Amino acid sequence: NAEKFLWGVATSAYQIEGATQEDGRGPSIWDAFAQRPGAIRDGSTGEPACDHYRRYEEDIALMQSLGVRAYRFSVAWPRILPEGRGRINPKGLAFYDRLVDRLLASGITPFLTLYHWDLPLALEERGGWRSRETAFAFAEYAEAVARALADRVPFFATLNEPWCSAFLGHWTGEHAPGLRNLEAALRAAHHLLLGHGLAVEALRAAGARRVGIVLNFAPAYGEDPEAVDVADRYHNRFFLDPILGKGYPESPFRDPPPVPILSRDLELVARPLDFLGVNYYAPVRVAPGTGTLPVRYLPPEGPATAMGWEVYPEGLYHLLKRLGREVPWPLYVTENGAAYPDLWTGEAVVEDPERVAYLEAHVEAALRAREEGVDLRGYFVWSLMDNFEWAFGYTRRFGLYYVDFPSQRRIPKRSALWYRERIARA
Template identity: 40%
Template structure:
């Protein structure tokens, strides 16, 4: 699922409506049966953070809402749908492997002050723990639940939800593009944190080139969630390159990929169970927030 929700389901509330969970599982069952024996690797959801928080709290993607509690419950329903889909996959004895592909970033504290460390812990947990811990440990990070409650948003968990989400997966997809340095700033955004420009090079979309964060986040995932097989399902950079005498030198992208592949190799040497790497490459998809 890469965010293409049928309008008929959105008209009923979209991912805020638990009926969408059942609709997705029914859709997945059709796919499992139709493509049986032809697909080795199945991914239930691509970047659930984007489907939930970016789309329903930040409002940058459709449906464009700015409601934290709505975004939290959309995220919760996505993870229930993930768990139910994995259960259906097992029930049907579908050949192949199944996992999901969250997007992650890495936040490094600006200083050794506890308030900076805590702010970055929240920033990382918003991407990592919130979407990993329910699957791998059957719980949400309590410190984030309490933080969101302090911001006026409560998570609506029903009996049996966490057991459904807590399904063993065969692999984990990881999408990584960027990271940042942050420090505590009271009242700044959702997490009381502001970003600090440390002079990192940036892509043409304004994202920091931060290969060290790639290494750090992969090692952190291994430390927190064990020896899960990992495929890098997205990694790449955005540059407005134009042909020069019929050639595209593409030096920025080459440099980006080189640095990140070095970090990837370092993570493997540190024991991270990397099974594959897919670069965000020649063809791009619909740019959801750019009007085309």
């Protein structure tokens, strides 16, 4: 390899597009979940988000203005196949086709996520990720998107953060579809991985040049080695070990329920990849506990963001060093960022010095791991702009650009100007 390092920003479809019931889009599990009282902190939904479905050209121009050279985005499955399987939605395919053309015209590498949490509701009605059939539906969807876009999109990631989809979506109930059942979560985890594995081969056969997956990591720390290892197996090895051909790690759970692993599934899951996407925000600090997951989480040692998430930039260094030893493929930091309070009152630049400091320190840590040998080929800020932050709605802002949601105005934060400088820095 001789490519220059890729400086990017990241978004996802439900979080920014709006047009939830336009141009043939079907409902996702998040559209339904956001109708439940108490599911979203501010009682909001993805409609209209950042109005990106209409405003994408402006958003690309913002990226170009910063010197961003890669854009990580997701395709909304229910905008392509509104019922998850069967019917195709031409206007949805046309939207992403045009988006890709416009990215290329602006010198920006598309970095495409197939699944970023917006499962078609029609599939959820049949068991969602708890049904093995959903994995096969996912691979068919992946194939369709590559058949349309792989001539121009170099990078396809199957899944974004399956740990969230499985455990937050099905064990804690904090994410769609809102289930609270460990067996359901373990079924979902397995069929997410199976869907990934099935999709790898479908994607390669359909011309996808670089195929990967995006995993989040929460490096674990604490006094007690056993508790730390339980947390590491749950947060960090649960999905990585299968993808590396190492099977599931020793279960982190007491008396776990059955998991529907069939003959040869793990071979599919471990199909070789071209890259691993690494998402990192914060470590976890743990003590022994008595629950089904036998750890207790401890509050941060020191500074934390508006999410209450510990600020620990050296954790990104150590994580990347570890992954470089363990993962035989190039790495991209596909999300890193911070939410601090921002409130626009008409200024030209929204001053966000705490976000700037977070980003500066995390980039330094990542680039230092890279200098020592880690094959880190890019870094993506989450996010380009403030957007719908899942169960927090519009109450938590991660953008380099502030979005005044009522008007859809984008206003640069100081961090946008910082990133422009950082990208160009000698």
